[PDB]
Design a protein around this ligand. Structure first.
Ligand SMILES: OCC[C@H]1CCCC(=C(c2ccc(O)cc2)c2ccc(O)cc2)C1
Ligand SMILES: OCC[C@H]1CCCC(=C(c2ccc(O)cc2)c2ccc(O)cc2)C1
Lengths: 13, 235, 239, 10
């Protein structure tokens, strides 16, 4: 499923 | 094998300090007093922005990076409000009777009454802050506690790696206390005292989560999609 | 008196105070329903509460408190205490919760009650953790006493040497835990690590009690099970 | 004078 948390964790800086 | 286990105590302290998220501001509108809608609006907007930085922080907690995405997501979904709350309590330590949500958003318990059913939670938060203040909680101890929440709160609702990292953080907390000049007895007593406070922080998060859901259903504030998703994790 | 106790005396006092293991009224011939299972758990919990109250009075330092402070701590901690007791009894029964010796339930039976299986799963996981840790009886009674004294200590509402007294007793129980571990041959490092491991479980027990209390409240509302007079008052204390 | 209080007294 799509989660914003997925994107945030993957693009964490 | 995880790089985190090789870290010395001093290295653990350094890494955690360097990972600390920034202190965010609220809106600069000075219109007072707050309505229930205005207040929940400001807290929600602030929490939403804090969440983004929390993820960056979590990724820099030694050991967190070694976890699968799934496990990282589970821990953050479980612990996010605990983590916001321990941060809040820490920021408020030197402001007895007040909650420093932001440097330009310092609130007392009477302003908690602005929102139905929030003053009870405000009171718990204040009590915790007062406890940290009387214990003279140190910044170094704080970041250890906050990392412990991240790793521990969701760990029973999935393993060995996480527990080894948790053990390393315990070692670090003890090292800090020994370095501060505490006797061995004082060290284990203080360790206990701090870790028991995490049980209260869990309680506050659970109370808060029900309050939020209640606010979602009542449509008092539009919650952000991210917040909706973090909230929805608690079913 | 509580602070003049040696570690061994603290342990012997707590062990002696242990409540007995009660039986349920489970009739194995009676097919389960949501109502009867909730009925069984409520009936059991209600009888356990009477034993818990008299147990608490034997916890060193507890009777030094005002009656109103005693009432508050038990109101806050009663389900946590039932649950850690439950998790302890279930240690040697993987995949099952031993509510009573004649009432051993698995997660499948938990699904008899809407929304309860999620809580069963958390309890089972805690039992698994205890088993993996090889939790000792002496550590368990310390932990249960910690819950009683800690869980309400920041929601009281002058004195405050009453709270300071509670914190000193709490410290003595920490001393006792470390003593047990040192006696078991653990290194200093191992002692602090285990102490932390044990106290961090109390966060999960708080979590389960919170979720449990909400579920219980929804049961009272839905008129599924009639709660006892004591349980009603203990539940209303969280609202 | 709730039940818990009484039992704590008893
Ligand atoms: O409404 C729930 C009660 C409230 C009590 C104070 C702490 C708390 C916060 C909160 C806590 C810490 C913080 O830095 C920023 C925000 C909250 C979080 C998300 C929201 O959408 C709204 C608020 C929850
Ligand atoms: O319905 C709430 C969730 C349920 C989940 C299992 C544990 C638990 C119990 C429970 C827990 C431990 C125990 O020895 C005896 C009983 C319960 C307590 C009071 C009641 O009126 C009903 C049940 C709460």
């Amino acid at each position: 499923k799509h989660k914003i948390l997925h994107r945030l964790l993957q693009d964490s800086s | 094998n995880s790089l985190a286990l090789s870290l010395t105590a001093d290295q653990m302290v350094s890494a955690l300090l360097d990972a600390e998220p920034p202190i965010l501001y609220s809106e600069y509108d000075p219109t007072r007093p707050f309505s229930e809608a205005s207040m929940m609006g400001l807290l929600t907007n602030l929490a939403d922005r804090e969440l983004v930085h929390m993820i960056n922080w979590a990724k820099r907690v030694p050991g967190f990076v070694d976890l699968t995405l799934h496990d990282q997501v589970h821990l953050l979904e479980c612990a996010w409000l605990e983590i916001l709350m321990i941060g809040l309590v820490w920021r408020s330590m030197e402001h007895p009777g007040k909650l420093l949500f932001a440097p330009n958003l310092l609130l007392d318990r009477n302003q908690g009454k602005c929102v139905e059913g929030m003053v009870e939670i405000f009171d718990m938060l204040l009590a915790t802050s007062s406890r940290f203040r009387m214990m003279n909680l140190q910044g170094e101890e704080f970041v250890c506690l906050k990392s412990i929440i991240l790793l521990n709160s969701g760990v029973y609702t999935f393993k060995d790696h996480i527990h080894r990292v948790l053990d390393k953080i315990t070692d670090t907390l003890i090292h800090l206390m020994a370095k501060a000049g505490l006797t061995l007895q004082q060290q284990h007593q203080r360790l206990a005292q701090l870790l028991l406070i995490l049980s209260h922080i869990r309680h506050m998060s659970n109370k808060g989560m029900e309050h939020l859901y209640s606010m979602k259903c009542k449509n008092v504030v539009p919650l952000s999609d991210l917040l909706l998703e973090m909230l929805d994790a608690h079913r």
